Design a protein around this nucleic acid. Structure first.
Ligand SMILES: OC[C@H]1O[C@@H](O[C@@H]2[C@@H](O)[C@H](O[C@@H]3[C@@H](O)[C@H](O)O[C@H](CO)[C@H]3O)O[C@H](CO)[C@H]2O)[C@H](O)[C@@H](O)[C@@H]1O
Ligand code: XKP
Ligand code: DCR
Ligand code: PLM
Ligand code: PLM
Ligand code: PLM
Ligand code: PLM
Ligand code: PLM
Ligand code: PLM
Ligand code: PLM
Ligand code: D10
Ligand code: DD9
Ligand code: DD9
Ligand code: DD9
Ligand code: DD9
Ligand code: HP6
Ligand code: HP6
Ligand code: MG
Lengths: 169, 25, 98, 999
RNA sequence: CGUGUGGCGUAGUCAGCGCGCUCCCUUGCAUGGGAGAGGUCUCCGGUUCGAUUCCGGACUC
């Protein structure tokens, strides 16, 4: 669909989105999660309370996908001939990006109880005493204009983070 | 005038050159 | 039992090396990307299935080793507690992604 | 005195005068057309070598030893090439290397004739022979990386010189003939395979390495007569058809695209793994099979049931256990099959593999035939003691074959049986399997370590396979999970779960079998290392104050060469002169405070009416602390005694340079701040320096001294230069302490004594820095370089430069040039070089530092080289032990004997394996120190780069050592190489096991 | 009373040359060139078609 949308007009892509790759990347993430939940629900059709019969299904899915990608790469190692190779690379790159995204957000979300409490700062700084140099220089003075934008970004990105957490829960 | 080194004569023998290097110090 | 004795023997040199001396998220993540992360995530899924279906006491040890394997680079990062640093790193990671 | 080479000229016993060697050089140059400005360079090189060797031995012994080292001895490379590629004597050398254990038209006859011819040469002939090789080595450019090509060229030229063709020619050969007609075509071949000419430029072409010919693939053609026979002229005629004396004249018609080919090729990596390390899978997998089959009756038991406890016949246990032999044989066959696809088919040594296959199949057969007889149903139904004796016999045949294939190396299995006239070996034994043997206590230690490791590992693995696996195997293999299954396939997926589980259990145990030998290796080494401490008598429990109180006597016995000196002074007046030097050196580096120094020096403040009270021991004996502590500690280990600094040899320190910063600019000092960072990082040094400023003092001088202070704390070249120029002051101090008659006789003329001390210290030590971009620095970089030449007048720098082409639209000319601090200033602002030598083109073809060192390597002097890098540092107390470090190559205190004496034989000689590398610590080792004669005659000091040099030196026949009282202040693709292929398939078993479990 | 004009310094006709930034490329450190991007004039309100500009209030120094 992306390639059929006026591929003969280069400036049209710049008019619409110079970096539509990120857009399709987000779309691919969404569809991967949705198709996951579809399998979760189809497996729970018989399973109103059974949590054991979908985990191994997830594992099986992931392994089969990796096998398919590996086979395609090995075949490619040995008109639209070159576009075929380009698309084979592109799909694999996109799938890797989606997996990395999910894993990274999963890692980040788990740290929340650590930062919720405010006393962790000094107790972590005890490690600075444990460190051999144990020298810290005061931060350079920042203008209040630098402070305003900093607070705005902190509020905005915190809101986005909590939105992602809400989606995942 | 020497071919590889234009600043030296052609007929200068090696011992002349070592003596010159000695006098350069 | 056997695997943990072997791992301890191989891990003594690191303890010896490091017990005598007493970062943005994007580069830190990319450094361990493709090495002991994807394999770990794949492994904790299977470990979770085995744990839920049938509970064996020694698997309690395994939940230790893998967990630390993911949490080592981040526990040792300086000033990871600060709100401003964490949210700035979040911004930087998001921008590196896109 | 006041003479350049005092150990040769000022002696009256010299067999050949200086004015008789200069005209030998001049005559060769006139006859074969060398360059003049390289003849001068090599005359200087040769004379310094003679001086260095004649200062601890007689002049005639010096000339004879040099001739033995370069052309005529068993430590020569030219002799080895001559015996392999001319007399065709490789297999006999292999046999001799094999049978040296019992030894200690024929090889003895050829050696007898060679010694007879070399024993009757005049000294003039020896000077001529050495001179021709050095002259050839000085032009060879990139052909220096390929030694056997150089040997071929030298032989051809020598054959031409003695002919009646040369000695009747009238006019001389035009200058520059050797480089134009002989050397440039080979360089053109080499370059025409990494680059191509596109639109008038050289652009690197991309192609697979299996079609690129490197240095080694050229080098290996000149190892066999079969390669020499392929060289063809433009007429289509062979080179070797001409009479011997005419081949050098035509050596410009040879076409090198029709000659050179590839000799070793790469493949997938697991094939390399399977072939290189077969001796380890043979010994793990076969024993695992033995153990698993003996303790697992269920698979070969008729109507097996633990309730009835019926066992199968013992014949079945032995016949089942006796498949370890077939498993080992199969592994060896697969290894040979994988090896056959590395080497070209018609190249010499590739027939051997074919024969090796046949024998292997035979063994496979004899080890599979009899077992079938037991498993045939004809003797199944009839119990006989014949079946029992057959099984019992085949068990020990299987044990025998497992041991045999675990011990013997793959290359060299059945060489003693062929007795054929053709090649018996896959690779050349002269240049690839010449390992230096072990002698003494370490030879038995190596056997004992490995015996202990493997005995413990096997006896322990059996008792953890017997019980963790006997009951699961018996239960999971006999249960019946009776179900309907899935009728699309059937029940075949519900009776098979227990057995799939059993297969997985066994596979994990099989994998775990490999991880136990590593543990036992670690444990046994640590116990042996602890146990050897008592014999070594290492004392760490002694108080720190118990080293410092013994320090003076150690200084007197191990730093000074006091034994030679006639005893005329008290040991305090000698130790004072060293201790005070160390302390003041530390003080001046802004590293100790004014009040700290007085606590430590020897003092003369007490009264001079009584000479005894003049000197008093310090209060200490009754960064700085770390240095002094390591100094005192390292002095406790055994140290070899020194020579007087008038007998010590010459050595060079060689450094590369590209893109590093010589000095810090003012912008990087006042902008971003660096100064504040450093002050916050080194505060006490900053306050000491500002105290120093008020002690003495736009302010240009303050600017420059601040720049110096800031440069002596960062990644700068000046830091390294200033650190490593401590050898000079160390040698001056040692020379003046050791003999006081000179200091007495000069009597107040401090200037004359300074000139004397500098003159002696100048001929023992050289510094060399190689900059490849001095031709195109911008003006401030040039200003820095000129400043360095001003601070240290004796430093030397080598660079590259370019000239416009002689004819229009052709290639520009390229030269390599040398300068130092005594060359005058030209009106152009540049300095005139001492030497300019023309090359055949741009020398930098591949990335790295190896090509950087190869072009400046023709300007080194001495006998030993120290290889450092851009960021390294040194200290005076460490530089004070150079004599003891250099005495570690085992050449300084040995007696001299005639190499060509009729009575000697090869087995009695004690000079067969020289030391090639010495590495320092706080067969792998980074090479700090290098034996220059050994190294520079067999390829470079480095190769396209450090571990490969160590492995090549080992394969060629040298030894590598480690020094424990010196410190150096330094701060995937391997498995597909030839070196692993040669090491893995030819080492004896114990050395192989030591090599494998490290890297 | 004065006062937070792009990240800083700011200047001003009833939003600027610099300076960083951001991108590209050359040169072994840079430098130089081409291209573009970052601004409510402390903040909150009133008047004026329109307010840094005329005024009222608020915070900091
Ligand atoms: O990144 C450093 C190093 O990582 C190596 O990867 C693995 C390790 O992830 C792994 O770590 C532990 C396991 O050995 C053990 O079995 O489980 C614990 C969990 O409790 C793990 O933390 O160890 C293996 C060794 O068996 C390593 O190979 C890379 O291999 C290595 O290349 C890399 O340098
Ligand atoms: C909810 C499912 C969403 C993901 C579905 C698509 C995954 C597809 C699997 C794949 O893409 O494989 C790996 C990634 O594996 C994984 O981490 C999968 C597990 C991630 C979720 C763990 C949750 C705790 C990519 O790296 P590679 O191993 O291929 O190596 C290439 C090196 N450059
Ligand atoms: C990764 C390395 C793998 C090494 C090989 C390990 C594989 C071990 C396989 C062992 C097979 C055991 C199969 C047990 C069932 C045998 C047939 C039973 C016949 C019967 O009694 O019905
Ligand atoms: C995040 C890791 C998952 C949870 C951590 C391990 C959970 C295991 C312990 C919970 C179950 C143990 C209690 C039941 C044991 C029993 O029945 O005897
Ligand atoms: C670990 C060993 C497991 C296998 C059990 C013993 C191996 C032999 C089993 C039968 C092999 C062939 C015997 C019948 C075939 C024949 O006699 O021709
Ligand atoms: C190597 C090929 C043969 C393999 C079998 C080796 C032994 C063959 C049998 C020899 C006879 C053994 C029994 C003798 C008694 C008999 O049956 O008459
Ligand atoms: C390679 C193995 C060789 C054959 C085995 C060794 C020779 C023994 C042959 C069979 C011996 C059986 C005993 C014969 C005596 C008898 O049956 O009366
Ligand atoms: C299955 C047999 C195991 C063999 C393992 C070898 C371990 C011992 C290695 C050193 C001892 C053998 C030394 C042999 C010396 C020699 O033959 O030249
Ligand atoms: C170089 C190898 C040393 C010789 C091998 C030593 C161990 C071989 C014997 C294995 C154990 C067989 C005896 C079983 C009884 C037991 O160990 O418990
Ligand atoms: C290499 C990983 C383990 C390999 C799997 C081990 C063998 C699994 C299947 C064994 C049972 C099926 C084959 C025999 C037929 C049968 O059980 O009746
Ligand atoms: C049953 C007695 C112990 C058997 C194992 C022996 C261990 C040897 C390791 C040195
Ligand atoms: C009861 C002793 C068990 C020891 C297990 C060690 C296994 C070595 C790999
Ligand atoms: C206890 C008998 C086991 C048989 C295995 C013998 C192993 C020989 C190395
Ligand atoms: C398992 C047999 C391996 C044999 C490799 C042969 C390679 C020839 C291409
Ligand atoms: C029936 C007992 C026969 C034992 C034969 C053992 C052979 C050892 C050489
Ligand atoms: C090496 C296993 C094959 C033996 C075949 C016996 C029939
Ligand atoms: C008839 C059973 C066939 C099993 C195939 C599984 C891949
Ligand atoms: Mg070193």
């Amino acid at each position: 669909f992306c390639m059929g949308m006026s591929c003969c007009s280069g400036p049209l892509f710049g008019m619409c989105c110079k970096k539509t790759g990120s857009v399709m990347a987000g779309i691919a993430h969404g569809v991967a999660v949705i198709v996951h939940i579809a399998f979760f629900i189809v497996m729970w059709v018989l399973e109103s309370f059974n949590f054991v019969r979908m985990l191994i299904g997830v594992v099986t899915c992931i392994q089969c996908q990796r096998l398919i990608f590996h086979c395609m790469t090995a075949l490619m190692l040995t008109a639209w001939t070159q576009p075929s190779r380009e698309l084979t690379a592109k799909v694999i790159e996109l799938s890797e990006f989606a997996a990395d995204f999910v894993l990274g957000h999963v890692i980040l979300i788990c740290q929340l109880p650590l930062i919720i409490i405010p006393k962790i700062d000094k107790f972590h700084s005890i490690m600075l005493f444990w460190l051999k140099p144990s020298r810290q220089i005061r931060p350079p003075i920042y203008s209040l204009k630098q402070t305003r934008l900093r607070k705005r970004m902190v509020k905005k990105y915190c809101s986005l983070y909590f939105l992602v957490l809400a989606i995942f829960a | 005038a020497d071919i590889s080194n234009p600043t030296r004569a052609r007929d200068e023998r090696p011992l002349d050159t070592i003596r010159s290097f000695e006098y350069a110090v | 039992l056997s695997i943990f004795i072997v791992f301890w023997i191989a891990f003594v040199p690191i303890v010896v090396q490091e017990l005598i001396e007493r970062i943005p998220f994007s580069i830190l993540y990319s450094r361990f990307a493709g090495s002991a992360i994807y394999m770990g995530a794949r492994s904790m899924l299977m470990l979770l299935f085995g744990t839920v279906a049938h509970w064996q006491a020694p698997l309690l040890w395994f939940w230790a080793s893998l967990s630390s394997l993911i949490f080592a680079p981040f526990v040792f990062n300086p000033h990871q507690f600060a709100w401003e640093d964490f949210f700035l790193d979040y911004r930087d990671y998001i921008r590196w992604l896109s | 005195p006041n003479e350049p080479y005092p150990a040769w000229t000022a002696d009256s016993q010299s067999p050949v005068s200086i004015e008789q060697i200069e005209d030998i050089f001049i005559d060769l140059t006139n006859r074969l057309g060398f360059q003049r400005d390289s003849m001068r360079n090599m005359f200087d090189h040769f004379m310094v070598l003679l001086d260095s060797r004649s200062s601890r031995m007689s002049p005639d012994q010096a000339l004879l030893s040099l001739h033995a080292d370069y052309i005529g001895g068993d430590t020569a490379n030219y002799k080895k090439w001559y015996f392999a590629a001319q007399l065709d004597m490789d297999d006999e050398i292999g046999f001799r290397n094999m049978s040296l254990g019992k030894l200690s038209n024929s090889l003895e006859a050829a050696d007898f004739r060679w010694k007879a011819k070399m024993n009757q040469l005049s000294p003039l002939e020896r000077v001529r022979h050495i001179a021709l090789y050095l002259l050839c080595w000085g032009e060879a450019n990139q052909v220096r990386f390929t030694a056997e090509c150089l040997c071929f060229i030298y032989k051809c030229a020598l054959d031409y010189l003695d002919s009646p063709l040369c000695q009747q020619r009238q006019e001389p050969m035009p200058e520059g003939d050797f480089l134009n007609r002989v050397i440039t075509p080979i360089y053109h071949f080499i370059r025409n395979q990494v680059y191509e000419i596109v639109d008038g430029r050289f652009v690197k072409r991309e192609r697979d390495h299996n079609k690129i010919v490197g240095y080694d693939d050229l080098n290996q053609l000149f190892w066999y007569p079969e390669g020499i026979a392929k060289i063809v002229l433009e007429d289509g005629t062979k080179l070797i058809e001409l009479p011997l004396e005419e081949r050098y004249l035509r050596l410009g018609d040879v076409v090198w695209d029709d000659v050179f080919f590839k000799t070793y090729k790469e493949t997938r990596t697991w094939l390399h793994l399977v072939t290189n390390f077969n001796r380890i899978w043979v010994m793990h997998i076969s024993i695992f099979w033995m153990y698993f089959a003996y303790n697992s009756p269920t698979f070969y038991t008729h109507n097996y049931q633990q309730l009835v406890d019926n066992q199968p016949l013992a014949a079945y246990k032995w016949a089942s256990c006796a498949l370890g032999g077939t498993v080992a044989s199969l592994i060896q066959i697969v290894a040979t099959l994988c090896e056959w696809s590395f080497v070209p088919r018609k190249w010499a040594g590739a027939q051997h593999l074919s024969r090796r296959f046949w024998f292997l199949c035979i063994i496979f057969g004899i080890n599979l035939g009899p077992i079938i007889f037991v498993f045939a149903y004809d003797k199944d139904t009839v119990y006989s003691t014949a079946a029992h004796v057959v099984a019992a016999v085949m068990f020990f045949v299987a044990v025998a074959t497992i041991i045999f294939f675990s011990i013997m190396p793959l290359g060299g299995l059945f060489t003693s049986y062929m007795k054929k006239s053709t090649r018996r070996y896959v690779a050349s034994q002269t240049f690839t399997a010449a390992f230096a043997p072990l002698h003494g206590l370490d030879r038995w230690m190596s056997y004992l370590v490995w015996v202990t490791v493997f005995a413990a590992k096997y006896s322990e693995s059996y008792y953890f396979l017997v019980l963790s696996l006997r009951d699961p195997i018996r239960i999971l293999s006999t249960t019946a999970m009776r179900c309907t299954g899935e009728y699309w396939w059937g029940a075949v997926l519900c009776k098979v779960q227990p057995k799939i589980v059993l297969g997985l259990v066994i596979a994990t145990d099989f994998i775990l079998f490999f991880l136990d030998t590593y543990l036992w290796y670690i444990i046994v080494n640590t116990i042996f290392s602890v146990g050897k401490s008592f014999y070594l008598g290492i004392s760490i429990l002694t108080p720190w104050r118990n080293i410092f109180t013994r320090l003076p006597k150690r200084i007197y016995s191990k730093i000074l060469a006091t034994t030679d000196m006639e005893i005329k002074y008290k040991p305090k007046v000698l130790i004072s002169q060293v201790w005070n030097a160390i302390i003041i050196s530390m003080y001046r580096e802004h590293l100790l405070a004014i009040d700290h120094v007085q606590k430590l020096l020897y003092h003369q403040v007490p009264s001079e009416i009584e000479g005894k009270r003049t000197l008093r021991a310090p209060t200490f004996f009754v960064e700085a602390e770390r240095r002094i502590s390591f100094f005192a500690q390292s002095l406790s280990t055994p140290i070899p005694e020194p020579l007087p600094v008038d007998n010590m040899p010459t050595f060079t320190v060689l450094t590369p340079h590209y893109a590093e910063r010589i000095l810090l600019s003012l912008r990087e000092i006042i902008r971003e701040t660096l100064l504040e960072y450093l002050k916050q990082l080194h505060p006490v040094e900053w306050e000491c320096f500002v105290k120093d400023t008020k002690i003495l003092a736009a302010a240009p001088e303050y600017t420059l001294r601040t720049r110096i202070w800031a440069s002596l704390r960062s990644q700068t070249l000046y830091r390294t230069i200033s650190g490593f120029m401590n050898y000079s002051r160390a040698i001056k101090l040692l020379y003046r302490v050791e003999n006081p008659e000179i200091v007495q006789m000069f009597g107040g003329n401090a200037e004359g004594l300074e000139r004397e001390l500098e003159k002696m210290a100048r001929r023992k030590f050289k510094f060399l820095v190689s900059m490849q971009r001095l031709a195109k620095f911008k003006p401030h970089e040039l200003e820095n370089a000129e400043f360095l030449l001003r601070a240290y007048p004796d430093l030397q720098i080598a660079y590259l430069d370019e000239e416009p082409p002689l004819t229009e639209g052709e290639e520009p000319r390229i030269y390599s040039a040398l300068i130092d601090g005594h060359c005058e200033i030209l009106d152009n602002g540049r300095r005139r070089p001492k030497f300019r030598v023309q090359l055949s083109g741009n020398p930098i073809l591949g990335d790295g530092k190896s090509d950087n060192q190869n072009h400046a390597l023709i300007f080194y002097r001495g006998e030993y080289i120290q290889l450092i890098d851009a960021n390294q540092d040194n200290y005076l107390e460490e530089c004070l032990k150079i004599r003891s470090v250099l005495a570690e190559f085992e050449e300084l205190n040995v007696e001299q004997v005639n190499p060509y004496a009729p009575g000697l034989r090869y087995e009695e000689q004690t000079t067969n394996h020289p030391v090639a590398i010495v590495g320092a610590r706080e067969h792998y080792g980074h090479p700090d120190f290098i034996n220059a004669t050994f190294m520079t005659t067999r390829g470079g000091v480095s190769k396209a780069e450090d571990i490969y040099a160590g492995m090549n030196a080992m394969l060629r026949g040298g030894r590598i050592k480690h020094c424990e009282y010196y410190q150096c202040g330094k701060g995937g693709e391997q498995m597909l190489s030839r070196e692993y292929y040669y090491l893995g398939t030819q080492l004896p078993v114990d050395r192989f096991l030591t090599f494998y479990y490290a890297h």
